[PDB]
Amino acid sequence: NGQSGRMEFFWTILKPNDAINFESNGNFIAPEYAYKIVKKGDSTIMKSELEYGNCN
Amino acid sequence: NHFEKIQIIPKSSWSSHEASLGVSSACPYQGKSSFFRNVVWLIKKNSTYPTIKRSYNNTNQEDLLVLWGIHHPNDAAEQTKLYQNPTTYISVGTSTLNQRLVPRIATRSKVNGQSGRMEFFWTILKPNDAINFESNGNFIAPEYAYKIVKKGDSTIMKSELEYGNCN
Amino acid sequence: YNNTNQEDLLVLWGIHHPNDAAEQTKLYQNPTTYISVGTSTLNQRLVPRIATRSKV
């Protein structure tokens, strides 16, 4: 995509009342927006080329 | 099915380093600060931590289980407070093992009253094989190893029950 | 090296782990060394590990 550099992204699950600490003197891709897991349930990642059909 | 604990590195052989000050409140024993009994937390002596070069040759006839570890401090100040060397390493080697551990310094939430971490490692030392430890700090030196004196069929069963005095 | 060929290329390389710092200077004269390999997908940096090991 016109770039020889690379971005290596990492993730972790931060449990309630736990703290995540960052110390960096360079090359830091600092987080801005996180995600809250407000509802857990039975889901899946389906691999298909189709799109919405406005049905049930 | 059975282990046999042997002393591979005596606690009193650490002349150049402090071996009896590696305790913390996180591991109490009868109201006193203590540590894991099968490893030794070495501390700098007289503000110096000379490079460690210790080796053990498995003169036994059985496979040997050796446990050691590395201590990850909280900040640069604690590293100088305990080992006096800003950059340290632990190199471990056998016929197959080739390992070099570098302490990772990061701010972490307190767990059991401590923010530091103890990362432990292991290897199987075959007979007539020797394990070599070189470290200039952050070394959790082994004291006792485990001899595998009887192999067989067993398992690790997850249950809340306890002994019932039955056959 | 550029894979001007039309087929997939399996490339092999390696790193040397010496016995002590004396051999490192004896063979390469540089105490701290590295090996960086990069492709469109690979981003690897190897650092030699110096330790005392049994003879094989």
Side-chain angles (χ1 to χ4, degrees), chain B residues 91-95 98 100 129-130 132, chain C residues 17 48-56:
Chain B
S91 74
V92 189
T94 69
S95 61
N98 177 26
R100 194 170 179 106
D129 197 13
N132 302 272
Chain C
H17 304 290
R49 299 190 294 281
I50 289 164
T52 299
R53 315 169 195 88
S54 310
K55 274 173 179 176
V56 178

CSV table of all heavy atoms in Angstrom, one decimal, chain B residues 91-95 98 100 129-130 132, chain C residues 17 48-56:
chain,number,residue,atom,x,y,z
B,91,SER,N,21.4,-16.3,31.4
B,91,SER,CA,21.7,-17.2,30.3
B,91,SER,C,21.7,-18.6,30.9
B,91,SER,O,22.5,-18.9,31.8
B,91,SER,CB,22.9,-16.9,29.6
B,91,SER,OG,24.1,-17.2,30.4
B,92,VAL,N,20.9,-19.5,30.4
B,92,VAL,CA,20.8,-20.9,30.8
B,92,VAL,C,21.1,-21.8,29.6
B,92,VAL,O,20.6,-21.5,28.5
B,92,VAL,CB,19.5,-21.2,31.5
B,92,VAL,CG1,19.5,-22.6,32.1
B,92,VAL,CG2,19.1,-20.2,32.5
B,93,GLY,N,21.9,-22.9,29.8
B,93,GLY,CA,22.2,-23.8,28.7
B,93,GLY,C,22.4,-25.2,29.1
B,93,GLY,O,23.0,-25.5,30.1
B,94,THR,N,21.9,-26.1,28.2
B,94,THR,CA,22.2,-27.5,28.3
B,94,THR,C,22.5,-28.0,26.9
B,94,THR,O,22.8,-27.2,26.0
B,94,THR,CB,21.0,-28.3,28.9
B,94,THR,OG1,19.9,-28.3,28.0
B,94,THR,CG2,20.6,-27.7,30.2
B,95,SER,N,22.5,-29.4,26.7
B,95,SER,CA,22.7,-29.9,25.4
B,95,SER,C,21.6,-29.4,24.4
B,95,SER,O,22.0,-29.1,23.2
B,95,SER,CB,22.7,-31.4,25.4
B,95,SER,OG,21.4,-31.9,25.9
B,98,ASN,N,18.9,-23.5,25.1
B,98,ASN,CA,19.6,-22.3,24.8
B,98,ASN,C,18.7,-21.1,25.1
B,98,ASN,O,17.8,-20.8,24.3
B,98,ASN,CB,20.1,-22.3,23.3
B,98,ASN,CG,20.8,-21.0,23.0
B,98,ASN,OD1,21.4,-20.4,23.8
B,98,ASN,ND2,20.8,-20.7,21.7
B,100,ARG,N,18.2,-17.1,27.0
B,100,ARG,CA,18.7,-15.8,27.6
B,100,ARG,C,17.6,-14.9,27.9
B,100,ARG,O,16.9,-14.4,27.0
B,100,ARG,CB,19.7,-15.1,26.6
B,100,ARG,CG,20.5,-14.0,27.2
B,100,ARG,CD,21.6,-13.5,26.3
B,100,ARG,NE,22.3,-12.4,26.9
B,100,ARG,CZ,23.6,-12.5,27.3
B,100,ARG,NH1,24.2,-13.7,27.2
B,100,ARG,NH2,24.2,-11.4,27.8
B,129,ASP,N,24.2,-34.9,31.5
B,129,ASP,CA,24.0,-33.5,30.9
B,129,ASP,C,24.2,-32.5,32.0
B,129,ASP,O,23.9,-32.7,33.2
B,129,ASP,CB,22.7,-33.4,30.2
B,129,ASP,CG,22.7,-32.2,29.3
B,129,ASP,OD1,23.8,-31.6,29.0
B,129,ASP,OD2,21.6,-31.8,28.9
B,130,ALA,N,24.8,-31.4,31.7
B,130,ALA,CA,25.0,-30.3,32.6
B,130,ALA,C,24.3,-29.0,32.2
B,130,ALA,O,24.2,-28.7,31.0
B,130,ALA,CB,26.6,-30.0,32.7
B,132,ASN,N,24.1,-24.8,32.8
B,132,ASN,CA,25.0,-23.7,33.2
B,132,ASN,C,24.2,-22.5,33.3
B,132,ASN,O,23.4,-22.1,32.4
B,132,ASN,CB,26.1,-23.6,32.1
B,132,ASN,CG,26.9,-24.8,31.9
B,132,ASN,OD1,27.9,-25.0,32.6
B,132,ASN,ND2,26.5,-25.6,31.0
C,17,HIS,N,25.1,-18.9,17.7
C,17,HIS,CA,25.1,-18.6,19.1
C,17,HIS,C,26.5,-19.0,19.6
C,17,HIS,O,26.7,-20.2,19.7
C,17,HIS,CB,24.0,-19.2,19.9
C,17,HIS,CG,22.6,-18.9,19.4
C,17,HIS,ND1,22.1,-17.6,19.5
C,17,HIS,CD2,21.7,-19.6,18.7
C,17,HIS,CE1,20.9,-17.6,19.0
C,17,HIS,NE2,20.6,-18.8,18.5
C,48,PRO,N,22.0,-12.8,18.9
C,48,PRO,CA,22.7,-14.0,19.4
C,48,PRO,C,22.5,-14.1,20.9
C,48,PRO,O,22.5,-13.1,21.6
C,48,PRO,CB,24.1,-13.8,19.0
C,48,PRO,CG,24.1,-12.8,17.9
C,48,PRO,CD,23.0,-11.9,18.2
C,49,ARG,N,22.4,-15.3,21.4
C,49,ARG,CA,22.3,-15.6,22.8
C,49,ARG,C,23.6,-16.3,23.2
C,49,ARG,O,23.9,-17.4,22.7
C,49,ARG,CB,21.1,-16.5,23.1
C,49,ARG,CG,19.8,-15.8,22.7
C,49,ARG,CD,18.6,-16.6,23.2
C,49,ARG,NE,18.5,-17.9,22.6
C,49,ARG,CZ,18.0,-18.1,21.4
C,49,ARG,NH1,17.5,-17.1,20.6
C,49,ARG,NH2,18.0,-19.4,20.9
C,50,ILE,N,24.3,-15.7,24.2
C,50,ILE,CA,25.6,-16.2,24.6
C,50,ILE,C,25.3,-17.0,25.9
C,50,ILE,O,24.9,-16.4,26.9
C,50,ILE,CB,26.6,-15.1,24.8
C,50,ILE,CG1,27.1,-14.6,23.4
C,50,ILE,CG2,27.8,-15.6,25.6
C,50,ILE,CD1,27.8,-13.3,23.5
C,51,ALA,N,25.7,-18.3,26.0
C,51,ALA,CA,25.5,-19.1,27.2
C,51,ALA,C,26.5,-20.3,27.1
C,51,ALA,O,27.0,-20.6,26.0
C,51,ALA,CB,24.1,-19.6,27.3
C,52,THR,N,26.8,-20.8,28.3
C,52,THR,CA,27.6,-22.0,28.4
C,52,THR,C,26.7,-23.2,28.2
C,52,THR,O,25.8,-23.4,29.0
C,52,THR,CB,28.4,-22.0,29.7
C,52,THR,OG1,29.2,-20.9,29.8
C,52,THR,CG2,29.2,-23.3,29.8
C,53,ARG,N,27.1,-24.1,27.3
C,53,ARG,CA,26.2,-25.2,26.9
C,53,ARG,C,27.1,-26.5,26.8
C,53,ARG,O,28.3,-26.5,26.6
C,53,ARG,CB,25.5,-25.0,25.6
C,53,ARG,CG,24.9,-23.6,25.5
C,53,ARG,CD,24.4,-23.3,24.1
C,53,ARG,NE,24.1,-21.9,23.9
C,53,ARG,CZ,25.0,-21.0,23.5
C,53,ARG,NH1,26.3,-21.4,23.3
C,53,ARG,NH2,24.7,-19.8,23.4
C,54,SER,N,26.4,-27.6,27.0
C,54,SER,CA,27.1,-28.9,26.9
C,54,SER,C,27.5,-29.2,25.4
C,54,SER,O,26.9,-28.6,24.5
C,54,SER,CB,26.1,-30.1,27.3
C,54,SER,OG,25.6,-29.8,28.6
C,55,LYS,N,28.5,-30.0,25.3
C,55,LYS,CA,29.1,-30.3,23.9
C,55,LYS,C,28.2,-31.3,23.2
C,55,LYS,O,27.9,-32.4,23.8
C,55,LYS,CB,30.5,-30.8,24.1
C,55,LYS,CG,31.6,-29.6,24.1
C,55,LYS,CD,33.0,-30.2,24.4
C,55,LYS,CE,34.0,-29.1,24.4
C,55,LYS,NZ,35.3,-29.6,24.7
C,56,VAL,N,27.8,-31.0,22.0
C,56,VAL,CA,27.2,-31.9,21.1
C,56,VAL,C,27.9,-32.0,19.8
C,56,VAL,O,28.2,-30.9,19.2
C,56,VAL,CB,25.7,-31.6,20.9
C,56,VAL,CG1,25.0,-32.5,19.9
C,56,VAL,CG2,24.9,-31.5,22.2
